[PDB]
Amino acid sequence: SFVEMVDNLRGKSGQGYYVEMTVGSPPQTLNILVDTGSSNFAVGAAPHPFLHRYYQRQLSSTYRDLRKGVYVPYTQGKWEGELGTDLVSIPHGPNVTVRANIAAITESDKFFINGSNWEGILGLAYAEIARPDDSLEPFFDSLVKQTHVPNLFSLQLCGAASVGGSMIIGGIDHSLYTGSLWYTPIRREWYYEVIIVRVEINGQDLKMDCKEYNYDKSIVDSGTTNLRLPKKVFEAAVKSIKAASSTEKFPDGFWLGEQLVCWQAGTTPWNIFPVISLYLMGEVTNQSFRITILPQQYLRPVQDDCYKFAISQSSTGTVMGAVIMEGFYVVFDRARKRIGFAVSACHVHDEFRTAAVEGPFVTLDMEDCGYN
Numbered sequence: 589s590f591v592e593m594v595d596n597l598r599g600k601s602g603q604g605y606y607v608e609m610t611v612g613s614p615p616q617t618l619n620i621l622v623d624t625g626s627s628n629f630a631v632g633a634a635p636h637p638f639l640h641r642y643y644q645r646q647l648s649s650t651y652r653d654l655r656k657g658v659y660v661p662y663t664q665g666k667w668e669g670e671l672g673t674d675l676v677s678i679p680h681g682p683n684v685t686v687r688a689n690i691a692a693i694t695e696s697d698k699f700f701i702n703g704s705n706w707e708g709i710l711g712l713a714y715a716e717i718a719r720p721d722d723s724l725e726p727f728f729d730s731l732v733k734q735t736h737v738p739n740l741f742s743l744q745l746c747g748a749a750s751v752g753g754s755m756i757i758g759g760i761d762h763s764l765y766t767g768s769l770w771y772t773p774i775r776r777e778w779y780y781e782v783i784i785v786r787v788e789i790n791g792q793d794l795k796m797d798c799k800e801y802n803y804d805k806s807i808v809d810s811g812t813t814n815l816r817l818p819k820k821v822f823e824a825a826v827k828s829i830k831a832a833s834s835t836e837k838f839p840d841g842f843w844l845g846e847q848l849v850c851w852q853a854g855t856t857p858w859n860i861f862p863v864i865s866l867y868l869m870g871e872v873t874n875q876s877f878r879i880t881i882l883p884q885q886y887l888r889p890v891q892d893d894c895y896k897f898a899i900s901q902s903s904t905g906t907v908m909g910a911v912i913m914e915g916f917y918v919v920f921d922r923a924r925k926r927i928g929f930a931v932s933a934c935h936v937h938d939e940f941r942t943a944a945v946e947g948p949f950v951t952l953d954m955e956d957c958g959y960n
């Protein structure tokens with residue numbers, strides 16, 4: 589069942605995790621970026637400098653035009669295209685074929701990435717944020733109503749120059765994580781929004797108003813590279829990581845992601861970089877759990893060893909991107925309106941520290957952490 593889906597994700601470092609899919613009749617094989625931070629299924633349908641191949645509706649026996657246009661803007665990049673429907677299949681997924689909506693991308697800007705090796709995007713979030721509007725069915729909703737595939741999927745993103753991982757569609761593969769799964773409620777169903785109730789850095793409470801962490805939302809977004817934080821939080825955090833690593837000095841544009849930093853290979857001072865603990869709302873009253881991330885997650889690798897600072901500011905709330913998701917087995921349990929976290933089988937090691945998921949913790953007034 590699920591062993592066929594283990595390792596069905598590929599990618600280049602810093603360029604995104606994709607899965608193999610086929611569209612149309614006869615089947616057109618395509619690499620599709622897996623994005624929990626959006627809800628449209630789209631593929632390049634026109635020649636592009638960065639695209640090795642693209643979707644051809646002309647050669648599809650099954651393609652149906654919807655004669656509606658569509659435009660989709662992300663934080664990074666944008667595109668427009670022609671809405672249609674076609675048969676879609678997942679080679680290393682469940683043994684099924686569904687008719688799903690597909691946006692055929694004819695125009696785009698700063699969206700496709702050179703060398704990334706993917707030609708499309710699979711938005712796995714809810715209809716509420718689908719473009720043009722919620723009447724356009726997202727892929728996973730189509731898959732669930734048309735088949736007996738359970739309303740659940742898991743993502744295990746394995747970090748660094750080739751990355752890989754697993755998208756378990758329809759279930760939970762217990763050989764891919766250690767310890768117990770801890771679950772946080774999905775607050776409402778648009779993005780996969782969660783509520784962060786406490787933040788620690790090297791075991792010291794950031795001591796911020798709970799609400800600041802979730803202003804105006806906090807989402808789990810596999811389509812985003814970084815851990816993005818609200819301005820006030822981000823400044824609090826950076827001040828703390830600086831002070832921890834003040835033993836060395838970096839140009840200020842490093843903390844902005846504008847510049848790299850290098851160390852002679854094998855001498856990277858991981859110790860002076862702190863661990864970050866995010867506390868998430870739990871399932872029972874006054875109960876939370878924490879996930880802890882190593883500097884090996886937010887110092888992304890680019891003779892020597894060079895790194896980019898992968899914590900950034902945001903004006904759309906906290907975005908728990910690949911930085912957080914790598915090294916965790918993440919269960920998007922839509923059926924039970926919850927997201928599970930567990931230490932990944934491909935958690936990446938520190939000599940004297942480890943990524944963790946721990947509970948139970950007690951946290952009072954967790955509902956006050958939510959922003960309205």
Ligand SMILES: CC(C)CNC(=O)[C@@H](NC[C@@H](O)[C@H](Cc1ccccc1)NC(=O)c1cc(C(=O)N[C@H](C)c2ccccc2)cc(N(C)S(C)(=O)=O)c1)[C@H](C)O
Nearest residue numbers: 602603604625626662663664665717811812813814900910
């Ligand atoms: C459709 C609507 C619901 C709009 N939704 C959204 O805007 C929300 N989520 C965004 C994602 O949907 C989209 C989908 C996408 C876009 C472009 C290329 C590939 C994939 N992603 C991004 O905007 C995005 C991408 C990157 C980035 O570089 N990604 C590469 C592919 C990657 C590398 C490694 C791991 C994962 C992804 C960065 C960023 N950053 C801003 S950063 C430098 O990490 O701080 C943002 C947003 C966070 O609020």
